[PDB]
C-alpha cells in the first residue's frame, strides 16, 4: 500500500488544542499519519490537493445496512466512504434471528467500521413496517439477545426499539421497560425511537437514562413532537445525559420543530440520516445534505461537524482523541462547506433552500483514500 | 478436461463405461476405454447418474438462524442441484439470491414462502401467524422477477406455525400458485391443520413433504381413511421430508409394503436436523432402500422426480454437449446405526457413498457426512 | 309526457318534449349520510341523476338501522331500499374499523328483530367478504350470513375482494336470489379472468347474481370485456358510490351504464340491468326515467318522475 501526502488541508473536529490553520498530512503504506506540518516532503507516493476541511471520518448512528437480509436496507457503499462516512452504525435491521448474517455480509467485508444496535425484536425489520418486529413478547427472547451480544460485543453496541404503534401496536411502553432492563444487564445504551403516540414520546424519555439515545428527536409528527406540548419540550431539554438524535427519515425530521429547538437552546446531540431504500432517494440524500439543513437552522459550524464525529462516536465508545497523532491510523473525511441555493425538503414536505453545503471530497480510511461526492437524486 | 473412467450409469441404458468431458465443462465423448492426452482422470471401479437433487433444504444462511451453508449439503456431499424450501418469503428473497444462488457451484433453486419474513426466526416467530404475513401482490412481483430462480410457493401448515388458522393459509397459497402457474409444496405436521385436508386441496404437480411422519395427529398409518386418499392422490407428488419430526422407517416400510412409494427423497436439512436425525442426502436415500423401496426406484427419487418438480430438464444427459453434471457414487455394503425423526433406529445394511460431484469442468471430491 | 320512447317494459299541467324507461334503481349505493363516515347525501345519486330507487349496501347493520330509516329513508324522495349488514357497526368507519372482525360484531337476535321491524325496508342481508374487513376469517362470517339470511327469507349480498375469503369459496355458499357484488373486478387474487376455474364456477353459477360493484376499485375495463365478450353478463349494473368513488373513478350511475355498453353489453341489456333485473333482487315492480344516448357513445338522464314531480336529471361533474 503506497503512502499518501493530503496536502493544503484545514483540520476541524479534533481535539479542542487542535490547529485550525492550514496543513499537510502523509499517511504511511500502513495507513498511519507519518508526519503533519505546514509543507512535509514524500517519496513517490499519491500527492492531493484541495484548497480544505479535514475532520475525523463522518459518522452516521442510524442507518440500514441490513442489504438482501432486510427488505428496506440499502447497502454501505450507498451510504459510507463514496459519502464521506467513515463509520456506520445499523439501528436495529437485525435481531439475534439473522445478526450473524449481518455480520458476515455486511460488517467484515466493509471499508467502513460497521457496529450495529440489536433490535429488541428477534426478526429486525426483515418486512420492515409490513410484518412489526415487537408484535408481543414472543418477539423477544433475552436469553439469545444476551447469546448473541456475548458473541458480538465487538459490533454490538446496544440495543434498539421502535416504540410506536406502527411497530409495537397497542402495548405501547412495557417493551422499552424490557428494552431498558437487558441493555442495563448487558452494560450497554439503548437508543430509542419515537412515531405515532401508543408508547408516547414523554413515557421513553422518563424511563431512558444517561447514555441513552433518542432517535427523531426533532419530528414534526402530531403526537410525537416537542413542539406541540411544552410539557414535553420541557421534559426534552431536561432529560441531562440522554443523547438527542436527529436521525432524519422520511417521516422523523422538521425544520421547523427543529428551529424553534435550537432558537431556544436545544441542539440535537448528534446528526444521522435515518437513510434506507425509502429515505435516500427522496427525503434524505446523504448525511452532508442532513449536516446542511441543521446549519440552515442556525446550529453553529462547529456543532454540526462535533454531532457527527465525536458525539455519535461517545455513544458506540469509539475512541475520537489525538486523531491527529503520529502513527494514529488515518481515518479522516475532506470536505468544503460552499454558497449554493439548494431547496431540501424535510420529513414535513416542507421545503427549505440551503444556502450552504456540507460537500464530501475524500474519504480516506488508513491508506485508501475515496472519492467523495454528494448523493444525487436517481428521480 | 476430465476423463471419468470405468463408470456404471442409472437414471439416465449401457453398462460400465467412459465420460470425456471438455474443457468448456460439456460431454466430448462417451464410451468404453476412451483414450486421453494429458489431462485429468478419475477411475474408480462405481455408479454414475445424474447430478443428485435435494427437493427440500435450507440454505439462506445468514439471511435466517436454522439455514445451513449450500457448501454442507451440496456438491461435497454429491449434490447438485439445492431447493432451499421457504427460507424466505417475497421480504429477503433477493439477498438470498445474491448471497446464496449467484456464488453457489451447484444448481440453486427455492420455493417462495407464502409468508412474507419466511424462516429468519424459524418456528420461534411464525411466518403464517395471519392474513397481514401474505401479500399477494409482492409475491408476484418478486416471482415475475425471479422466475428463473422460484420454482414454487411454500406454505408450512401445521399449528406450530399457522397456530389456530386452518386450511385458509393453504387455500390462499393454493389460489396463488395458480396465478403464478407454479406448484406448491405443503408441509404436514400437528393435526390444526389436517393433513386429509391438504391433499383434498392439492392438485397434479403440487408436492406434500413430511409425507412418512410418525408424529400423532399427521400420520398416513394411524388413520386408514387418511392413508387411502394418500394413495389415491394420481399427480400429487409425496416427498420425504425427513428432518428431525418428519420420517419414520415404520411408516415407510408399511406405506413401501403397501405399494406407495415417496416421489421424491429429500432431507429437510437445517443447523438442528444435519448433526443429528439426518446427515446428507446419501443416508435418506440409505433409509428408504432400507425399507425396500427398490434402488432404480431410489435413484429416480433423488433426480427424475424432484428434476420434474423444479422444471430441471434431465433428458439426453450423456449426449455430446450437454453440459456435464453427474453423481459419481458406490453402493457399499455396510451395519452402520442410524434412526428417524422417532428415535426408531435400524441397521443399513448397504450405503449409498458419494465419490465426486461433476458439476460442468469441475469435479469435486465427495463424501457422507 | 311526449316525444318519449318506452324501453325495458299525464298524471294528478305541463309534459316536456327522448327514451323513457321504469325509474332505474342502483343496488349497490352507499347514502347513510351523517351516520357514516364514507355515505354520501340521497341527493348526490338518484332523484336529480335519473334514479328512483336506491339500495344502501350495509351503511347500516342493526345498531342503527332506526337511524338510517328516519334521516335517511322517510324523508327522502326516492325509493329507498337496504342490505342489513351482518355486522352491527356498519360502515361507520369503513375500513378504518372493520364489521366483521368477530363473532362478537354479529348479533342473530338482533338480527332478526331489526328484520321484523323493517322487513318493508330491508331487502337482504350484506357481507364484505376480504381480509380487510374480515381479517384471517374468510368463509365462517359468509357462511353464518347464508344461515341467517336462509332462516329470515331474504337475499344476500356478498361483495368479493382480497383473497382471504376466496371469490371462489364465496360462490359456493351462494344460492339463487343471492348476488355477488364486484363481480368483474380486475384485482389480484380476485379477479375472474386470472384463474379459469373461477370464470367457469362464475358462469357455472344459473341463479347466483352478478353485480357491477364499480367502486373505487372494483371495475375493470379489460375483465368486462373479456367476461361480458364470451357470454358472462352483469344481471345488474351498479356504482359502488360513497364519499370516495363518487366524485373520481364511478361518478355516475349513467356513466357506469355507459361503461357497460361500451365493452359489448347490449342497450336492451343494460337498461334491463338497471331496472327489472336489479328490481328482482328487492322484489320491486307514477315512476320514470327518460334519457338519450348521445355521442363522444354515452347515458343522459333528462328526468325523474316521481308522481307529478319531474325533477331536471343530469349526470355528475
Ligand atoms: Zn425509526
Ligand atoms: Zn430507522
Ligand atoms: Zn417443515
Ligand atoms: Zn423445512
Ligand atoms: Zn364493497
Ligand atoms: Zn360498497
Not at 463522518?58 to 450507498?78: M, N
Not at 413496517?129 to 427472547?141: G, Q, S
Request: charged content about 25%; some cysteine.
Amino acid at each position: 500500500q503506497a503512502p499518501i501526502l493530503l496536502t493544503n488541508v484545514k483540520p476541524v473536529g479534533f481535539g479542542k488544542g487542535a490547529s485550525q490553520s492550514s496543513t499537510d498530512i502523509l499517511i504511511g503504506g500502513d495507513g498511519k499519519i507519518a508526519a503533519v506540518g505546514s509543507a512535509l516532503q514524500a517519496p513517490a507516493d499519491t500527492q492531493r490537493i484541495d484548497a480544505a476541511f479535514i475532520s475525523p471520518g463522518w459518522v452516521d448512528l442510524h442507518v440500514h445496512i441490513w442489504h438482501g437480509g432486510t427488505d428496506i436496507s440499502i447497502r454501505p457503499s450507498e451510504c459510507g466512504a463514496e459519502r464521506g462516512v467513515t463509520t456506520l452504525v445499523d439501528a436495529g435491521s437485525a435481531g439475534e434471528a439473522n445478526f450473524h448474517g449481518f455480520r458476515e455480509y455486511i460488517i467484515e467485508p466493509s471499508r467502513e467500521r460497521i457496529k450495529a444496535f440489536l433490535n429488541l425484536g428477534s426478526i429486525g425489520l426483515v418486512a420492515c413496517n409490513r410484518v412489526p418486529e415487537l408484535r408481543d413478547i414472543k418477539d423477544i427472547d433475552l436469553d439469545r439477545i444476551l447469546e448473541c451480544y456475548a458473541e458480538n460485543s465487538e459490533h454490538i453496541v446496544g440495543l434498539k426499539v421502535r416504540a410506536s404503534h406502527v411497530i409495537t401496536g397497542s402495548w405501547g411502553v412495557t417493551p422499552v421497560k424490557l428494552g431498558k432492563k437487558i441493555a442495563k444487564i448487558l452494560k450497554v445504551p439503548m437508543m430509542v425511537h419515537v412515531g405515532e403516540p401508543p408508547a408516547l414520546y414523554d413515557e421513553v424519555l422518563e424511563i431512558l437514562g444517561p447514555g441513552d439515545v433518542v432517535t427523531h428527536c426533532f419530528n414534526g409528527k402530531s403526537g410525537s413532537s416537542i413542539m406541540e406540548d411544552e410539557d414535553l419540550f420541557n421534559l426534552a431539554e431536561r432529560c441531562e445525559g440522554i443523547r438527542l438524535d436527529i436521525g432524519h427519515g422520511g417521516a422523523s425530521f422538521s425544520f421547523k420543530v427543529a428551529e424553534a429547538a435550537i432558537a431556544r437552546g436545544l441542539l440535537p446531540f448528534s446528526i444521522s440520516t435515518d437513510l434506507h431504500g425509502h429515505s435516500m432517494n427522496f427525503p434524505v440524500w446523504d448525511l452532508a445534505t442532513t449536516m446542511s439543513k441543521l446549519l440552515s437552522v442556525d446550529m453553529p459550524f462547529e456543532n454540526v461537524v462535533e454531532a457527527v464525529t465525536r458525539n455519535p462516536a461517545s455513544v458506540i465508545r469509539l475512541d475520537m482523541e489525538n486523531r491527529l497523532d503520529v502513527g494514529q491510523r488515518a481515518d479522516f473525511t475532506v470536505f468544503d462547506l460552499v454558497d449554493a441555493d439548494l431547496e431540501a425538503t424535510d420529513s414535513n414536505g416542507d421545503v427549505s433552500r440551503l444556502k450552504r453545503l456540507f460537500e464530501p471530497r475524500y474519504a480516506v480510511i488508513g491508506a485508501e483514500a475515496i472519492a467523495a461526492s454528494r448523493y444525487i437524486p436517481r428521480a
